[PDB]
Design a protein around this motif. Structure first.
Motif, mmCIF file in Angstrom:
data_model
loop_
_atom_site.group_PDB
_atom_site.id
_atom_site.type_symbol
_atom_site.label_atom_id
_atom_site.label_comp_id
_atom_site.label_asym_id
_atom_site.label_seq_id
_atom_site.Cartn_x
_atom_site.Cartn_y
_atom_site.Cartn_z
ATOM 1 N N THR A 141 0.856 -1.188 0.000
ATOM 2 C CA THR A 141 0.000 0.000 0.000
ATOM 3 C C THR A 141 0.891 1.237 0.000
ATOM 4 N N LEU A 142 1.525 1.469 -1.144
ATOM 5 C CA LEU A 142 2.325 2.659 -1.397
ATOM 6 C C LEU A 142 1.721 3.282 -2.648
ATOM 7 N N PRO A 143 0.603 4.004 -2.512
ATOM 8 C CA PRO A 143 -0.032 4.580 -3.704
ATOM 9 C C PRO A 143 0.825 5.632 -4.387
ATOM 10 N N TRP A 144 1.801 6.211 -3.693
ATOM 11 C CA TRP A 144 2.604 7.291 -4.252
ATOM 12 C C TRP A 144 3.878 6.787 -4.912
ATOM 13 N N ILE A 145 4.042 5.475 -5.003
ATOM 14 C CA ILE A 145 5.146 4.862 -5.730
ATOM 15 C C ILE A 145 4.544 3.990 -6.818
ATOM 16 N N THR A 146 5.095 4.077 -8.029
ATOM 17 C CA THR A 146 4.552 3.359 -9.180
ATOM 18 C C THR A 146 5.389 2.104 -9.389
ATOM 19 N N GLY A 147 4.881 0.967 -8.940
ATOM 20 C CA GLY A 147 5.583 -0.284 -9.146
ATOM 21 C C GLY A 147 6.615 -0.590 -8.079
ATOM 22 N N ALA A 148 7.395 -1.617 -8.364
ATOM 23 C CA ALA A 148 8.459 -2.148 -7.526
ATOM 24 C C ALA A 148 9.771 -1.435 -7.823
#
Ligand code: NA
Ligand code: NA
Length: 437
Positions: free
Chosen positions: A44-51
Motif C-alpha cells: 500500500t504505497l499509492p505514491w510509488i509506481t511499481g516495484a
C-alpha cells in the motif's frame, strides 16, 4: 568461489525531492554480483509506481536501484522501505550486524510550494489578506528573527469587520497589580454584583463562541420567538447576544453577555466541564444539567424538546475518522468545538477550544486548524498544525490527529479526541414557527 554480498550504509536515508520522477540510489556489490531482487516492505504505497528495480550493474562495485515516485503534493515527508531477497535462498539479505534485514529508508521530501484551500464555518466570512498575521518562530520561549513560511500559518486577527467569536478567560488575561480592581465584576440578571472567575471554563468559552454564532445565524427565528413565544419573565433579558469587538484586554468582562452568563452563574469544577453540557444548559431543559449553574437558561426548550437535538458529540481515532467528521461538520453549516487530550508536560492534558475553519492541501488532507483558544492572550484565531501519528497511506487502527502548536513553535503530545458540534436546527425552528402562525 566466494558468494557475492551486498552492503548499504543504512544510516543514509534516500531522500527524493517532492517532484515526480524515477529516483536512484546505489548498493555496494562485493565479490561479484549477487542475484537478488529489491522489494518495498508495503504493498500500500499509492505514491510509488511499481516495484524497485536494478537499473544498472555495469559498475562491478555497485548496483543502481531505481524507483518511481508521484509528486508529493503534501507538506509532509513520506516514508517507504526497501528490502532485498536473495533469489537463490529465498531469504531476505542481512544488513551489517548479520541479524537484521538490510533495509533502505526512503523519505520523499515535503512540497515546499503547496497550493492550499480553506473551508470556514458557515456564515463567518473568510480572512482578508490584511487580517492574516504571520508568526515568528520561537526558541526556548524567545521569538527568533525567523518566521513560519508555510502559507497556511497565520493568525486570523479580530477586527471590527470579522465575524468569528473568541471570548477569552479573564483569569488568563488578568495581570495582578495592573488591571482594574473590578475586572471580574459582572452585573447579574437582577442587577446584582458578582465576581465571576473563569480559570477552568474552557468548555464554557467554547460553548459561548458557538452560541454567539448560533444566535447570529438564527437571529430572524429568534426575533420571531421573542414576538410569539410566551417567555418566562425572568428570562426575557437573555434573548440577546452582544459581542463587542475592539475592547482592550482590561475590558474583557464587558465584551460578551453569553460568556458572562457562564462566568456569573455556572458552578465550578477544577476538572473542567463539557462543551455539550454548556450548550444544552443554554438552549433546552435536561435533568443532567439541572445542577450546572444557579440558574437554568434553557432558552428555546419549546423548540427542541422531544425533537432532534442540534448538539452532537463524536470521537475520532484515525485520520479518516477526523477528516470525515470535520468535512461533514463544515459541509453541514455547523459550528465546531474540539476537546483536546494528551500531555502538556509530565501532566495529563484536557482542554476545549473552538474551531472556525481548516486548511487543506491539494490531496484534500487537512493540514491546519484555526482555533479560538481562550487560554491564549491575543484577540486572534491561532493556527494549530495537524500531524498524524504514523503512515497516513497505510493507516493503522489508531492514527490520532496530533497538534503542532505554532504559538509555542513546537509539537505537543496533544491530539483531537473528538468534536462537539452545534447545528442551526433549521427543521426544528421551522416546525416551531409553523405551529405559531
Ligand atoms: Na505502489
Ligand atoms: Na486551562
Amino acid at each position: 568461489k566466494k558468494k557475492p554480498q551486498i552492503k548499504y550504509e543504512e544510516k543514509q536515508a534516500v531522500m527524493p525531492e517532492s517532484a515526480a520522477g524515477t529516483y536512484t540510489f546505489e548498493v555496494q556489490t562485493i565479490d561479484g554480483k549477487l542475484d537478488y531482487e529489491p522489494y518495498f516492505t508495503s504493498s500500500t504505497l499509492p505514491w510509488i509506481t511499481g516495484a524497485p528495480t536494478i537499473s544498472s550493474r555495469t559498475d562491478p562495485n555497485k548496483d543502481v536501484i531505481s524507483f518511481t515516485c508521484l509528486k508529493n503534493k503534501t507538506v509532509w515527508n513520506r516514508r517507504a522501505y526497501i528490502k532485498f531477497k536473495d533469489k537463490k535462498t529465498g531469504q531476505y539479505i542481512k544488513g551489517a550486524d548479520g541479524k537484521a534485514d538490510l533495509t533502505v529508508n526512503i523519505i520523499q521530501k515535503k512540497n515546499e510550494n503547496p497550493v492550499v484551500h480553506y473551508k470556514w464555518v458557515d456564515g463567518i466570512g473568510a480572512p482578508t489578506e490584511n487580517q492574516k498575521i504571520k508568526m515568528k518562530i520561537k526558541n526556548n520561549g524567545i521569538e527568533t528573527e525567523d518566521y513560519f513560511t508555510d502559507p497556511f500559518v497565520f493568525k486570523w486577527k479580530e477586527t471590527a469587520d470579522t465575524k468569528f467569536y473568541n471570548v477569552r478567560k479573564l483569569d488568563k488575561l488578568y495581570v495582578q497589580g495592573q488591571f482594574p480592581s473590578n475586572y471580574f465584576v459582572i452585573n447579574g440578571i437582577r442587577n446584582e454584583q458578582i465576581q465571576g472567575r473563569d480559570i477552568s471554563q474552557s468548555w464554557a468559552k467554547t460553548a459561548s463562541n458557538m452560541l454567539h454564532w448560533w444566535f447570529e445565524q438564527n437571529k430572524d427565528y429568534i426575533e420571531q420567538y421573542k414576538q410569539k413565544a410566551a417567555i418566562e419573565e425572568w428570562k426575557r433579558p437573555l434573548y440577546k447576544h452582544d459581542y463587542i469587538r475592539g475592547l482592550q484586554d482590561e475590558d474583557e468582562g464587558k465584551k460578551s453577555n453569553i460568556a458572562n452568563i457562564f462566568r456569573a452563574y455556572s458552578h465550578n469544577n477544577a476538572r473542567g466541564g463539557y462543551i455539550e453540557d454548556g450548550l444544552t444548559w443554554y438552549l433546552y431543559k435536561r435533568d443532567g444539567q439541572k445542577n450546572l449553574g444557579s440558574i437554568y437558561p434553557g432558552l428555546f426548550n419549546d423548540v427542541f424538546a422531544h425533537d432532534t437535538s442540534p448538539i452532537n458529540i463524536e470521537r475520532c481515532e484515525t485520520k479518516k475518522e477526523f477528516e470525515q467528521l470535520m468535512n461533514k461538520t463544515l459541509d453541514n453549516k455547523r459550528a465546531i468545538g474540539i476537546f483536546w487530550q494528551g500531555s502538556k508536560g509530565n501532566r495529563p492534558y484536557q482542554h476545549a477550544v473552538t474551531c472556525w475553519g481548516a486548511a487543506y492541501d491539494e490531496d484534500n488532507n487537512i493540514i491546519c486548524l484555526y482555533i479560538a483558544e481562550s487560554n491564549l492572550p491575543e484577540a486572534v484565531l491561532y493556527p494549530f498544525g495537524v500531524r498524524y501519528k504514523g503512515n497516513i497511506y497505510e493507516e493503522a487502527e489508531k492514527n490520532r490527529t496530533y497538534m503542532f502548536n505554532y504559538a509555542l513553535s513546537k509539537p505537543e503530545n496533544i491530539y483531537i479526541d473528538g468534536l462537539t458540534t452545534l447545528d442551526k436546527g433549521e427543521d426544528q425552528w421551522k416546525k416551531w414557527l409553523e405551529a405559531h402562525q
